Amino acid sequence: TQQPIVTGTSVISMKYDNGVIIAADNLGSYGSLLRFNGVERLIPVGDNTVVGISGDISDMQHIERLLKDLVTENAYDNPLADAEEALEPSYIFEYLATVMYQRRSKMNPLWNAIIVAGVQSNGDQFLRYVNLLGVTYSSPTLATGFGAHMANPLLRKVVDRESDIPKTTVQVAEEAIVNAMRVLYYRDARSSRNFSLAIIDKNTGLTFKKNLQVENMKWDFAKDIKGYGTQKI
Amino acid sequence: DRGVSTFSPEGRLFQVEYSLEAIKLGSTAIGIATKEGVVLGVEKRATSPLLESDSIEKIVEIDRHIGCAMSGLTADARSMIEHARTAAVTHNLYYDEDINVESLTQSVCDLALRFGELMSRPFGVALLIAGHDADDGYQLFHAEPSGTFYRYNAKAIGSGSEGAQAELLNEWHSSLTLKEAELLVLKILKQVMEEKLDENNAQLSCITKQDGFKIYDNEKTAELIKELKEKEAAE
Amino acid sequence: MDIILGIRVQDSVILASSKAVTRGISVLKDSDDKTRQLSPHTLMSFAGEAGDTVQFAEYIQANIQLYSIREDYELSPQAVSSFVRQELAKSIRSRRPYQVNVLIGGYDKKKNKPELYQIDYLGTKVELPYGAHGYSGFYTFSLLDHHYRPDMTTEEGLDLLKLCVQELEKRMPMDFKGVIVKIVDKDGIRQVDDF
Amino acid sequence: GYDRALSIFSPDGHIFQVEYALEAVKRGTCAVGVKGKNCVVLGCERRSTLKLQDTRITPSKVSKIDSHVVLSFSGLNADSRILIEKARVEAQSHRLTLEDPVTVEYLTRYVAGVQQRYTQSGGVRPFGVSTLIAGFDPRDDEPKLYQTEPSGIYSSWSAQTIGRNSKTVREFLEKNYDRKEPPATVEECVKLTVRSLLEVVQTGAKNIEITVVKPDSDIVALSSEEINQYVTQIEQEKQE
Amino acid sequence: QFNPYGDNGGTILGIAGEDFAVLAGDTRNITDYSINSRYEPKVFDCGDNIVMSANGFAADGDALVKRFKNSVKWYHFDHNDKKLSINSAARNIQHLLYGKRFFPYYVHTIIAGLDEDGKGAVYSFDPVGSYEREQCRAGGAAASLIMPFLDNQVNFKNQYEPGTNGKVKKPLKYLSVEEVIKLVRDSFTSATERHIQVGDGLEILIVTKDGVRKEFYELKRD
Amino acid sequence: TTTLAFRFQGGIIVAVDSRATAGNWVASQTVKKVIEINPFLLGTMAGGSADCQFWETWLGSQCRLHELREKERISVAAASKILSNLVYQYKGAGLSMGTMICGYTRKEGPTIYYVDSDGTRLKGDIFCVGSGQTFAYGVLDSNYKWDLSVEDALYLGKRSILAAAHRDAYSGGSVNLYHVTEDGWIYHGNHDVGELFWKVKEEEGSFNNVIG
Amino acid sequence: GSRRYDSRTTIFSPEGRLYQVEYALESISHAGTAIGIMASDGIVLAAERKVTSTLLEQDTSTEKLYKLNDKIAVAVAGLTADAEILINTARIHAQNYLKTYNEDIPVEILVRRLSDIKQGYTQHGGLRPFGVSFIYAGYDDRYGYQLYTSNPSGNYTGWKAISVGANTSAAQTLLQMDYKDDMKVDDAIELALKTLSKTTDSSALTYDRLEFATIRKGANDGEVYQKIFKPQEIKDILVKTGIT
Amino acid sequence: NNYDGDTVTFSPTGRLFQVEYALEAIKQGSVTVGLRSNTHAVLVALKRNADELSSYQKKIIKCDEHMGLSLAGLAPDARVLSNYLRQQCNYSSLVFNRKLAVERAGHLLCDKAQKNTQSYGGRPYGVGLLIIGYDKSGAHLLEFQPSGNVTELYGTAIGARSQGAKTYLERTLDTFIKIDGNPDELIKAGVEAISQSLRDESLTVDNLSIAIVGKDTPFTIYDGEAVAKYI
Numbered sequence A: 001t002q003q004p005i006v007t008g009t010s011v012i013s014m015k016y017d018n019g020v021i022i023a024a025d026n027l028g029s030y031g032s033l034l035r036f037n038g039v040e041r042l043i044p045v046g047d048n049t050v051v052g053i054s055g056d057i058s059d060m061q062h063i064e065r066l067l068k069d070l071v072t073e074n075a076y077d078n079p080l081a082d083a084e085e086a087l088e089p090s091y092i093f094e095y096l097a098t099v100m101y102q103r104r105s106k107m108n109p110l111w112n113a114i115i116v117a118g119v120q121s122n123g124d125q126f127l128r129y130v131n132l133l134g135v136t137y138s139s140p141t142l143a144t145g146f147g148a149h150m151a152n153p154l155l156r157k158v159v160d161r162e163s164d165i166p167k168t169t170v171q172v173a174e175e176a177i178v179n180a181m182r183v184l185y186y187r188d189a190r191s192s193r194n195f196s197l198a199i200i201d202k203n204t205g206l207t208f209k210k211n212l213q214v215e216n217m218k219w220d221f222a223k224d225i226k227g228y229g230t231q232k233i
Numbered sequence B: 001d002r003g004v005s006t007f008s009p010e011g012r013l014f015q016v017e018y019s020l021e022a023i024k025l026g027s028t029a030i031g032i033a034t035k036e037g038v039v040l041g042v043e044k045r046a047t048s049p050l051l052e053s054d055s056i057e058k059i060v061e062i063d064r065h066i067g068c069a070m071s072g073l074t075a076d077a078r079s080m081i082e083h084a085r086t087a088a089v090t091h092n093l094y095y096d097e098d099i100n101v102e103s104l105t106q107s108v109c110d111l112a113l114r115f116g117e118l119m120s121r122p123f124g125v126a127l128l129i130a131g132h133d134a135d136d137g138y139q140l141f142h143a144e145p146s147g148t149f150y151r152y153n154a155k156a157i158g159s160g161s162e163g164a165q166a167e168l169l170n171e172w173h174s175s176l177t178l179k180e181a182e183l184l185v186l187k188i189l190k191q192v193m194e195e196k197l198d199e200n201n202a203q204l205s206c207i208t209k210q211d212g213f214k215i216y217d218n219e220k221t222a223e224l225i226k227e228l229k230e231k232e233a234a235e
Numbered sequence C: 001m002d003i004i005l006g007i008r009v010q011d012s013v014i015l016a017s018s019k020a021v022t023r024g025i026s027v028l029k030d031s032d033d034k035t036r037q038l039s040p041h042t043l044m045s046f047a048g049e050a051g052d053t054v055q056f057a058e059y060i061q062a063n064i065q066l067y068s069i070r071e072d073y074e075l076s077p078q079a080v081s082s083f084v085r086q087e088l089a090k091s092i093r094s095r096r097p098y099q100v101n102v103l104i105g106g107y108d109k110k111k112n113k114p115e116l117y118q119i120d121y122l123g124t125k126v127e128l129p130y131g132a133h134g135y136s137g138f139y140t141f142s143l144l145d146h147h148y149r150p151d152m153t154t155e156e157g158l159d160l161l162k163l164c165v166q167e168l169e170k171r172m173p174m175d176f177k178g179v180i181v182k183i184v185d186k187d188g189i190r191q192v193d194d195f
Numbered sequence D: 001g002y003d004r005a006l007s008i009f010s011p012d013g014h015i016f017q018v019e020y021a022l023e024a025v026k027r028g029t030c031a032v033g034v035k036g037k038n039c040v041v042l043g044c045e046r047r048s049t050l051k052l053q054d055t056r057i058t059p060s061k062v063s064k065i066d067s068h069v070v071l072s073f074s075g076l077n078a079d080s081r082i083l084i085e086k087a088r089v090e091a092q093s094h095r096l097t098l099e100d101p102v103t104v105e106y107l108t109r110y111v112a113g114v115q116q117r118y119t120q121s122g123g124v125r126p127f128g129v130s131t132l133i134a135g136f137d138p139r140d141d142e143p144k145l146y147q148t149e150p151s152g153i154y155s156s157w158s159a160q161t162i163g164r165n166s167k168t169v170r171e172f173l174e175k176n177y178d179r180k181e182p183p184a185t186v187e188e189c190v191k192l193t194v195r196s197l198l199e200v201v202q203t204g205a206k207n208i209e210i211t212v213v214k215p216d217s218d219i220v221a222l223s224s225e226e227i228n229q230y231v232t233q234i235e236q237e238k239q240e
Numbered sequence E: 001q002f003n004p005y006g007d008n009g010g011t012i013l014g015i016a017g018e019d020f021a022v023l024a025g026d027t028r029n030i031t032d033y034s035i036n037s038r039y040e041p042k043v044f045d046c047g048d049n050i051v052m053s054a055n056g057f058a059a060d061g062d063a064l065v066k067r068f069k070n071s072v073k074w075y076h077f078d079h080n081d082k083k084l085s086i087n088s089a090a091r092n093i094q095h096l097l098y099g100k101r102f103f104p105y106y107v108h109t110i111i112a113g114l115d116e117d118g119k120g121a122v123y124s125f126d127p128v129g130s131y132e133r134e135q136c137r138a139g140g141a142a143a144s145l146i147m148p149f150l151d152n153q154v155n156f157k158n159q160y161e162p163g164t165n166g167k168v169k170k171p172l173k174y175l176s177v178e179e180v181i182k183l184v185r186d187s188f189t190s191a192t193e194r195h196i197q198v199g200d201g202l203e204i205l206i207v208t209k210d211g212v213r214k215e216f217y218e219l220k221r222d
Numbered sequence F: 001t002t003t004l005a006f007r008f009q010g011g012i013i014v015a016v017d018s019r020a021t022a023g024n025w026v027a028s029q030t031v032k033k034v035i036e037i038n039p040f041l042l043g044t045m046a047g048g049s050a051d052c053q054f055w056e057t058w059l060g061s062q063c064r065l066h067e068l069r070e071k072e073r074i075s076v077a078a079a080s081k082i083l084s085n086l087v088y089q090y091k092g093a094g095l096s097m098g099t100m101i102c103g104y105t106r107k108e109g110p111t112i113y114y115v116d117s118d119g120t121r122l123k124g125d126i127f128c129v130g131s132g133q134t135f136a137y138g139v140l141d142s143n144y145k146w147d148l149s150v151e152d153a154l155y156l157g158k159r160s161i162l163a164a165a166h167r168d169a170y171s172g173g174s175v176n177l178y179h180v181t182e183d184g185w186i187y188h189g190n191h192d193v194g195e196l197f198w199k200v201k202e203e204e205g206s207f208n209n210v211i212g
Numbered sequence G: 001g002s003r004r005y006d007s008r009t010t011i012f013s014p015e016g017r018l019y020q021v022e023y024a025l026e027s028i029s030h031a032g033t034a035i036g037i038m039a040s041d042g043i044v045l046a047a048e049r050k051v052t053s054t055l056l057e058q059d060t061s062t063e064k065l066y067k068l069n070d071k072i073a074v075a076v077a078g079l080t081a082d083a084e085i086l087i088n089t090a091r092i093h094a095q096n097y098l099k100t101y102n103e104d105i106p107v108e109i110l111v112r113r114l115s116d117i118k119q120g121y122t123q124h125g126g127l128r129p130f131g132v133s134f135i136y137a138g139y140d141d142r143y144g145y146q147l148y149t150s151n152p153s154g155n156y157t158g159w160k161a162i163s164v165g166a167n168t169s170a171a172q173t174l175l176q177m178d179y180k181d182d183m184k185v186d187d188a189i190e191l192a193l194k195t196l197s198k199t200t201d202s203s204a205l206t207y208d209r210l211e212f213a214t215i216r217k218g219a220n221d222g223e224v225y226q227k228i229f230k231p232q233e234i235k236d237i238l239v240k241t242g243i244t
Numbered sequence H: 001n002n003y004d005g006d007t008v009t010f011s012p013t014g015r016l017f018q019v020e021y022a023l024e025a026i027k028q029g030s031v032t033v034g035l036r037s038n039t040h041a042v043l044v045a046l047k048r049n050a051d052e053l054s055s056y057q058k059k060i061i062k063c064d065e066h067m068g069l070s071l072a073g074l075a076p077d078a079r080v081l082s083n084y085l086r087q088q089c090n091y092s093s094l095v096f097n098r099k100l101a102v103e104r105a106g107h108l109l110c111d112k113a114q115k116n117t118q119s120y121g122g123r124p125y126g127v128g129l130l131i132i133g134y135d136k137s138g139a140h141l142l143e144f145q146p147s148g149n150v151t152e153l154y155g156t157a158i159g160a161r162s163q164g165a166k167t168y169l170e171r172t173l174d175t176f177i178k179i180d181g182n183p184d185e186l187i188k189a190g191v192e193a194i195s196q197s198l199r200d201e202s203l204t205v206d207n208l209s210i211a212i213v214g215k216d217t218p219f220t221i222y223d224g225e226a227v228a229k230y231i
């Protein structure tokens, strides 16, 4: 039995024709206090997978260490560690899913919501979710926390079903993700303006973008709003 | 001295090979498999005439569809039978079905090599496991203390085994009736036994799909002994 | 379970135990014998939590019978009571304690004296001329304080016991379906069939 | 824990520790069991190199396992106590779970199983004891007599003997016991038992113990004078 | 305080015919008032012509299916590639569930297939392992909506022969695979209308002696 | 649930309903509440369905092991005590079982044992167990005599379950009848309350509270 | 491994004897003789100290005779250190019984349990047996006065008069000669001393080489008293019987 | 001589005699052959009987859908080791959703056998194994020895008279390695290979045992009338 202390908010993601995109802000909240601002919540595993984590940050750092160790262990006595026997996104996910469910079953969970995004060896897009309860699911778009309530509706307008994936380019997909991050900054009280974004493409590979900022914000209309009903000045 | 789980220079486990010698000293047990059933017969061999022979229990039920005969240090067989019965009933509890004869035998043979420095020595008893299931039909298995088991059409174990086995080689064919098999066990037992064969010093049993595993009465066996003597005199 | 009584007189110990077994709003049985013979001259009645009672009684019975076979000798009522007390005294600090109260009636053959011991589930032992467990005592103790004499006969003790059962049948809320009465004396244990 | 495999096979296929345990039984004082038409009698030898003994308190050779079953033995005395204790505990445990006393066959099977376990367990030696177990099943009047030995094998006997010079008394019983007509009464059964011990014992004074078991938990041990009367009667018929 | 259980919604349905059996389930996965996935299958081919679904808390559901699939694998290894009969599977699943009697799998389990006489079979389980063979069973969030409809249309309950004064019951008969799929589709469209956790898609698994076939149909996405 | 079993001149009658509930949701109308342990032993089930089903099948495995080991069919007393000792080990853990072990043996004769999940074990001639036990008692007790015929005893058992099925909301479905003799148990059919109630009402003239 | 150095203490010889038990008995046969004699009104325990030195403190010494409880005592023959391990166990066992049943432990029950401990060391554990033989002298209300002996095998027997340790063969013959059943304590005292005096390996039996104890009902009315004799009391009883 | 009492003792020349005696048990075992191309991997095994009344001891065991082995020596030890492999393959599937690499399978068997050669009380395994499999890097063939030594090969053979088949495969190397997309021909080559180890006995219908795994072929075993094609 736990309670989360230092926490990270939404992680959002979606599939597009040639790969997957995933994003998360760089904030480590301490309750209502916006304590830490240099926190990276997207963790790449190899050159074909990115694990996005929300929830407790101490538990996130533990999971970082596990993935780091997984890469080391896979390299042992493995001549094809950088080729056919490299770590796939599906292997990394199933490992985490196993751990998450085992920890909930011992009544001592890792207080997290996790999205594993990547591309398989055969080119197939991989995107799957897992949380503290060991619950797993997959969808063209996936999001955690407030992202589930606000990002998913926006991302589903681009990719509503499977057949919409080939019709969606990386330009269109990234635009939707960046827009969703802006909306979350408007509306989530535990979000920050600074965020990271990662693209895993079957052709161009892994592209990791740091120190992005929410921009093109609409605030001007605020000057016209006066009082809460009857006030005129 | 020397380790219990030591290999000889020829590549055999000393203790397993020595336990095989103990089994050769044991009383004879014979099994024959047919398409109408499997017959199991044993030599009781009472050490003294005051001993009540009906208390000598060398043929044993494992389940309704599986029976067992033994030879060697028969006291060692008690925990093997206990395990076999539990394995059979447990499988019925987990799967609502009868357990395959081969799977039962394999479970018993897993105990065999669980000795060393687990129990202190191998078993000094060999088992003949007979039964029926829907998949492979009527079956006979010879389970050794080496952990190995062979399926047999017919098999003899104990002191008169090599002589009885040679006789079974000639007599067995694929069209034997159950009655023919019963007489054949009695015939071969009478040959290798020291004392003269009768209903009190020898015991028969069988397993059929319809009636399951049955140990024969001394009255029923006595008639089969009389039927056997008459047929040999008739030519 | 509910009503168990005990009276020690001049030459015997008399135990009375209710026959009812109730669960919920149903009397499941009206002929239940809430007692076990521990040895030829020692009898134990019991009352308390369902299941625990019989499980405890039979466990004690097995241990005393084991002792008897081992030593070819009968333990004194005092010795048996001390053994029972210790078992309950262990139990009360266990993960799940036995919730069982007992009376032990015995005839000591070496002393030629009847003996009655009252032991509760905590392991609280007392030797008494008369005893009861549960709500029964709230009626019977005051009654026996008045009518009991130490030199009474077995017949006088049974009449004294009838007086207790009558009072309980008048003032107790629950129907306990009468009692089974047993006598312990120099000749052993016997049951009164017409009570 | 001490793990050594003490009981092991030899090249010829023998377990010497089990066989040497039989030698301990052969050294022990003679014990005999004879079952009649309505009873079983257990006879036991007591060696007379021990005078100044206190027979009140000295452990008796025949032990009650329950009110309806008895156990005598030959071999190491200290070893026998361990088997008797375990048997007595199992007897009470059976009554507790099955709500019925043990059969003589069941009790024997248990004691034999304990003996067998000590032949293939690490760190232990076999029991240097063979037992004769006798009694009557609950609500049954058919007499029961069983024998066990260190290896763990057990079997039923019309009459049997164990211990030193047991081969001599077994020889006697083999010609004097008729299967078609067992000792019809208690007196006949005790006499045949005493006769058989008189082939081996020495004097019929304080050397022979006799215990008679009858149906429905009816077990009694004979005194010196009672046994001495059988000894006196047998010798007078012998001079012929 | 940490709560180890959750509710992932959805509903499942099993019907048995003469020489076939279907096991249907919606593809929607939810938590509270949010949709997690519009297509997340929860009806699985487990081998040996056995289909299985464990609806309720998805983490426990996946764990169970995973363990049973593994149980089938080891049954082959230990018993000479013998086919695991539907009745034997059912008993095995009881022990899987009851093994966690004091920390249960929070699921309604249904399996379907053919019995050893070739006839259609459906078994249903409670969370702790009690089971029963039936012609008909609905499980999950909308079980209470669908089940009474099945009683009426599959087992002809409360239906009497016209003109017989309510004396002669409508006789029981097996339904064709065409008729059964009609009932499944109508059951799920009705459930989708009136239950918020049910919708998006319907996936049916049909089991005959020839193998396991699949059929998919769209459901309302609101 | 409603289950009963009573002893009489001609052996033992055992009768049960077939309903299973989860709160007010009627989950099944076709549950088998009698477990056939061997040709001479029966077990009834009331309370938690998984608990009863699991442990009474387990009981059957223990009884089979007894007759393999002892070459003799287990006594009703010993069979009931295996179950009662088992549930006593789990006392406090939350098992929910009200069972009746019914059967015939030579040494005992016809015997019934009540066994429940708080460890109570009682020998007796009549028992009713379950949420509708009181309704069954009312009819059974008021019509019970030792000298009932096999035909009348079967009907009284059937009629007592029907009484409870009618009044108790958590009992119903159908009636399963069993008769236990010296030769073993005999099944006397599944009787749907749907048809049985009206058939009994018409023929017997009872159930006048209901609109005919 | 370590198999190489294992003596195998708990095995049978080809003749069916326990090597270590037999060799432990051989050890005990060199220990100072101890005698127990049971009379109708009490029990005597007499024991010879092992070759004494003149600078040994005699009065504050205990080697042979030990108290188990108020009603039971033991005479020791063998390794003293081994005996004390067993004595403390026996003392504890007696108190466990008293705590459980509120009655003093019957003599045989105490003897059986101590003997069962010895038996265990001969059947399992791979340890050497205890090189000790006890003479138990005690009283209870069932059998009254009782004498027992136990040895490394764990076998125990009851006696009217018995000796352990050195020269038991000669000692037992002398006891068997002069013992009779109607004997009193004061007569048994004289027999015990006379027997040691003849079987001793020393030149002459003196007070400083002896330990002596009685268990009488010689207290006031129906109760038992244990008397462990002081040096001066042994000196007097030796003069009173005319040995010195 | 004095240094063969247990596995924990080295000889003066640095030999482990108990391990060598375990190796001797393999030489007494019936012959079994392993070979592979780029697409498929094949096991062929000569089964042995007690007599004409007995069955023929099964030599081949399935470990997963993509992996299995053949045995030579103590059969119960093969059952222990195969069971361990089954669990390890299964652990890889449940935890990582990953088919166990045939190379890792070999590393795991090596380490399990080794522990039994360095501790008091235990004994070495008395069996040799030929593991075939098809994984993400194509077809594989491994040879396990109970000393711990595991070796990857194109082809090999173990058991009595295994030198005949091992020589043949050494000659045929260039031919059979290029038998791609043709199962029956790769088996024919394996059947002809094991034939070089036969003396007085020939391959009959209940004597021969074949197993195959490959690109579009799960690990399957052929016995009885299913191998009559290859005689």
Ligand SMILES: *[C@@](C)(CO)[C@](*)(O)[C@H](CC(C)C)NC(=O)[C@H](Cc1ccccc1)NC(=O)[C@H](CC(C)C)NC(=O)[C@H](CCc1ccccc1)NC(=O)CN1CCOCC1
Pocket (backbone or CB within 6 Å): E101, E104, E126, E127, E128, E130, F001, F002, F019, F020, F021, F022, F023, F025, F027, F028, F031, F033, F045, F046, F047, F048, F049, F050, F052, F096, F130, F131, F170, F171
């Ligand atoms: C009469 C009919 C009612 O008392 C009988 O007593 C029968 C006995 C027969 C069936 C053997 N008893 C029941 O029907 C019994 C009543 C009951 C319920 C819960 C606890 C104790 C007693 N019902 C059950 O056991 C049902 C049977 C199912 C519906 C086939 N099972 C449940 O209610 C299960 C398991 C309950 C449980 C017990 C112990 C630990 C965990 C769970 N519960 C659910 O399925 C929960 N729920 C059902 C509704 O859908 C959402 C999930």
Ligand SMILES: [Mg+2]
Pocket (backbone or CB within 6 Å): E221, E222
């Ligand atoms: Mg909606």
